[PDB]
């Protein structure tokens, strides 16, 4: 097989796997393909001289493939899907193109919601976040449903992209806004439940504490709303 090393962002201790949805996506892709790979964390506040020599000024994630540096998460994904292909490897591209766009609008609504520091804007931003979650929920509950993942019962590239993002949204919105994805969004919860039972997702997730810390200077705290 080819020689593959994945370089990811280090967490707050400079060694752990840090918060980064792009790192996790690539880690998940390589896992799902079943190829040998290694994983190296990179502490951006104390970057090793040897890594700056290997990949000058390159921010994680990136890989080497047979010693050649490859960058840009989307291009790396496309390359891995192309090269690591049937019959030997599983094709991970979704069958349904709508799987590739489902939930892709959530992260930006989340980001605005948690970065906002005006209490008066909170409800509007919370509603926009909920509207995008609702769309995903409907996708997950509509026949392509009791299916496990976005595209069916197998994990696909679309899951590798979405799950890291949705996980961040869940952890960070809870910690900093006391926000819960409504239990009434049963499609989302079926999906997350399925994902949290899969080592490909759980083993590649940063700890809750690391995700929370990564946002401690991003999320803006708001005064508690006072009833009437």
From Swiss-Prot:
Q: Where is this motif: G-site?
A: 20-23
Q: Does the keyword Lipid metabolism apply?
A: no
Q: How does it sit in the membrane?
A: Single-pass membrane protein
Any one cellular-component term (Gene Ontology): cytoplasmic vesicle membrane
Which keywords appear in this protein's UniProt record, sorted alphabetically?
Acetylation, Cell junction, Cell membrane, Chloride, Chloride channel, Cytoplasm, Cytoplasmic vesicle, Cytoskeleton, Endoplasmic reticulum, Ion channel, Ion transport, Membrane, Mitochondrion, Nucleus, Oxidoreductase, Phosphoprotein, Transmembrane, Transmembrane helix, Transport, Voltage-gated channel
Recorded family membership: Belongs to the chloride channel CLIC family.
- Domain writeup: The active G-site contains a monothiol Cys-X-X-Ser motif which mediates glutathione-dependent redox catalysis. Members of this family may change from a globular, soluble state to a state where the N-terminal domain is inserted into the membrane and functions as a chloride channel. The redox status of the active cysteine in Cys-X-X-Cys/Ser motif likely determines the capacity to adopt a soluble or membrane-inserted state. A conformation change of the N-terminal domain is thought to expose hydrophobic surfaces that trigger membrane insertion.
Q: Which NCBIfam families does the record match to this protein?
A: O-ClC
Q: What does this protein do?
A: In the soluble state, catalyzes glutaredoxin-like thiol disulfide exchange reactions with reduced glutathione as electron donor. Can insert into membranes and form voltage-dependent multi-ion conductive channels. Membrane insertion seems to be redox-regulated and may occur only under oxidizing conditions. Has alternate cellular functions like a potential role in angiogenesis or in maintaining apical-basolateral membrane polarity during mitosis and cytokinesis. Could also promote endothelial cell proliferation and regulate endothelial morphogenesis (tubulogenesis).
Q: What's the name of the protein? A: Chloride intracellular channel protein 4
Instruction: Please report the organism this UniProt entry assigns to the protein.
Output: Homo sapiens
- From the UniProt record, report the name of the gene that encodes this protein: CLIC4
